[PDB]
Design a protein around this nucleic acid. Sequence first.
DNA 1: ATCTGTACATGTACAGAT
DNA 2: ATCTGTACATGTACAGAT
DNA 3: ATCTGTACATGTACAGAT
DNA 4: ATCTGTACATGTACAGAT
Lengths: 356, 352
Amino acid sequence: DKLKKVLDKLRLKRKDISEAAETVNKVVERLLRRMQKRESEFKGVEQLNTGSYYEHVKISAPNEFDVMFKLEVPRIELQEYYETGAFYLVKFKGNPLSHFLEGEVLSATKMLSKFRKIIKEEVKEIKDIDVSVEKEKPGSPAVTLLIRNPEEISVNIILALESKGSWPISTKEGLPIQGWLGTKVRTNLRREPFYLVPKNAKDGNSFQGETWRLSFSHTEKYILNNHGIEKTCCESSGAKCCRKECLKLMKYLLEQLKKEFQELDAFCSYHVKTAIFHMWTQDPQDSQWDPRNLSSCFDKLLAFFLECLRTEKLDHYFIPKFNLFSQELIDRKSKEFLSKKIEYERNNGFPIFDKL
Amino acid sequence: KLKKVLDKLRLKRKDISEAAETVNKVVERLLRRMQKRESEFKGVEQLNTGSYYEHVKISAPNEFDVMFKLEVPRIELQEYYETGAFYLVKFPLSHFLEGEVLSATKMLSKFRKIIKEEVKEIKDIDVSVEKEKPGSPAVTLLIRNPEEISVNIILALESKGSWPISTKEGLPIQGWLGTKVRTNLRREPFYLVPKNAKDGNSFQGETWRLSFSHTEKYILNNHGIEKTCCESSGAKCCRKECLKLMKYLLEQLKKEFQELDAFCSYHVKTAIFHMWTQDPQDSQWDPRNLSSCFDKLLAFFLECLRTEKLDHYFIPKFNLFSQELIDRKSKEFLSKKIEYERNNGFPIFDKL
DNA sequence: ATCTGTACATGTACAGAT
DNA sequence: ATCTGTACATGTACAGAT
DNA sequence: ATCTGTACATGTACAGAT
DNA sequence: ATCTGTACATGTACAGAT
Ligand SMILES: Nc1nc2c(ncn2[C@@H]2O[C@H](COP(=O)(O)OP(=O)(O)OP(=O)(O)O)[C@@H](O)[C@H]2O)c(=O)[nH]1
Ligand SMILES: Nc1nc2c(ncn2[C@@H]2O[C@H](COP(=O)(O)OP(=O)(O)OP(=O)(O)O)[C@@H](O)[C@H]2O)c(=O)[nH]1
Ligand SMILES: Nc1nc2c(ncn2[C@@H]2O[C@H](COP(=O)(O)OP(=O)(O)OP(=O)(O)O)[C@@H](O)[C@H]2O)c(=O)[nH]1
Ligand SMILES: Nc1nc2c(ncn2[C@@H]2O[C@H](COP(=O)(O)OP(=O)(O)OP(=O)(O)O)[C@@H](O)[C@H]2O)c(=O)[nH]1
Ligand SMILES: [Mg+2]
Ligand SMILES: [Mg+2]
Ligand SMILES: [Zn+2]
Ligand SMILES: [Zn+2]
């Protein structure tokens, strides 16, 4: 109860899912077409639907869709950027990517800028949908579309490189799903390709325009939809669990707080997604996520997340040495501020869940 | 106890390597011949199946099952007399047709002639082609490493369509392995093998039988309700050991008594599939409860015998214990001999 | 004449709707 | 509890290309 | 189209620990 | 007696090269 009513509020409506997906699929399909037309450099790119809507943890409204446009790049050499584990330079062995080359090195911002120019041109030609292109955001690997379905919808077209080689060594000790999803699943997932998206920092740091960042959105999608230690978890002949509902409630808490308070700008939903992947590793049994224990299940996730904030440690699930909560990324000011806001909501009935 | 019997049944690492190097030598050479030649089975691929590749072979690595699978599009199927598993096939292979009917006997016999020719050319291994068992879908090789090793080479057609409607209700794993696993498995191809021998009551020679050896192998190696069952970071179960004990009990009874000729290890494999479905939780197969697990398997197999009903796990209407397949007499004999061993501490488990 | 990238045809898990 | 729209994986048809 | 290279599942074999 | 850790061995998926 009580948290069940919040989830009722957060539950997406099928009427809205239809209207939104109808428009979104028309726009995405046309953009994917134009990428294959001509001697375009992005010929061959394939679509991958990712993120919370395709993991079924989108909340409130179907107003934001992530879609990777992924391009296989056969012979590629990687160079780690300053032992960060997550950031790389790409290098190469006629070739469509040549215009973005900078002496062996693939420029991310050069690729993205031409990707984006092509997108904007195609968008000019959509005459039956109110759709434009958001101004570029620092740090975004995406070209974001703003659709007015009347209702506002964002579509993030994420540009990605696809390598089918084995994953970079910095992930060797990531994905610690052995006690939970098991060794066969882990091995099979690491047989899948890995992905590189533009870092696009705009900070002024050296190599800024040529650094890429690993993405595991496809793996995360598989894990969200195959999340139980039992194969029948949340299936029609198995037992429902509350894992996704805890992720929804945590996402909602952060979203509500983030739109009230500018102090929380450095925080994003990927921080809560990473924290709950750790909780799912720490508590692997499906019975540690009984729907009847939704309150304490949510409560123990808060407690884990507060400890991550207090101790300033939230390791990337796929790249253990990459701390999303380091000082270099988020001030202790920000963290103590969110720690107190969460602490407050937790001990006063979650008044922010009733906001708006 | 049963632990001690399981130590006996366990294969030796040295034996596995000595047997497999020889077997792989012959098999690659045979698979090469169907391939690098202008043969009508150009295309076949190797599919290793059965107990050795499922890690439930017992006593010795002395029998190997290999599918040579050949893809065929269109391949319209017609069911044989509502039996479920038996079909005629319709429409390189035109040499084996009759009246738009693909004759299993005619394709097997050329398949067999090919293998015999290639076997005559192997001069580095003592290997011969066993006399054909009429019906049987296999061409069987006998190898004397020095040890005797059978290699059954099973001709199969591979089809990519929806599985035939007689399986629609089979593979009832939804509460054990789940719906996603079942749907994924039924997205795999299905196989037909040239199993014949209906004495001489005709249609005999053009019949094929459905094979699910590929699905069974996936199940054997992905058998828990938890994904970690028998993995290095999960808990061991005793499901496979129970299958081994049951196989050995029938193996030992069949050596003794010719009354049990109609019985085969597949009857045991089918029965334990049903019991794994009845008892899906991994905790119902705890290693510490090996005995009661073996016993409840015994009691289910006896119930199958008593009721004369052991449905094909993939084809529910096909009763492997029908009066037409196994005489009522044979099933009461097997009942009495199993009840005997059970009630006396399994003496046959001691004898050599 | 034959070949094939594109898209339709089929089936079902997920989860919202009634 | 059943009915149902979307997403998605795989099998296959054929208009347009060679 | 074929075949090697790699990674890790699944097994057995045995000493040291429990 | 059983459990545990390391070593030893085959099977099998698939990327990448030719
Ligand atoms: N490695 C890495 N991945 C990120 C990061 N931020 C976002 N992602 C990925 O981006 C995808 C979508 O990002 P978001 O739109 O912000 O959040 P979401 O998962 O779609 O959830 P919603 O906010 O409800 O849309 C996820 O599938 C993540 O895998 C990051 O900082 N590092
Ligand atoms: N598939 C996929 N989508 C991503 C990934 N990273 C980001 N996105 C999407 O792109 C949008 C902006 O990208 P970010 O890099 O996360 O934005 P940012 O500038 O770093 O700022 P914050 O999200 O607050 O950390 C997000 O809302 C996601 O929807 C990724 O790694 N994979
Ligand atoms: N559908 C079906 N499959 C069969 C039948 N008999 C044998 N098989 C299949 O053939 C494979 C090998 O058969 P066998 O060598 O007789 O037995 P096994 O499973 O390998 O076990 P062992 O007796 O120890 O060698 C099995 O995995 C079965 O899938 C049958 O009568 N019907
Ligand atoms: N992989 C695989 N091997 C099979 C299959 N069917 C038969 N075999 C092999 O062929 C051998 C003999 O075939 P059986 O199914 O026993 O048929 P049979 O030899 O005509 O004699 P019966 O058992 O009396 O019907 C088995 O021991 C298996 O090794 C199958 O469907 N898949
Ligand atoms: Mg989303
Ligand atoms: Mg066998
Ligand atoms: Zn669940
Ligand atoms: Zn197990």
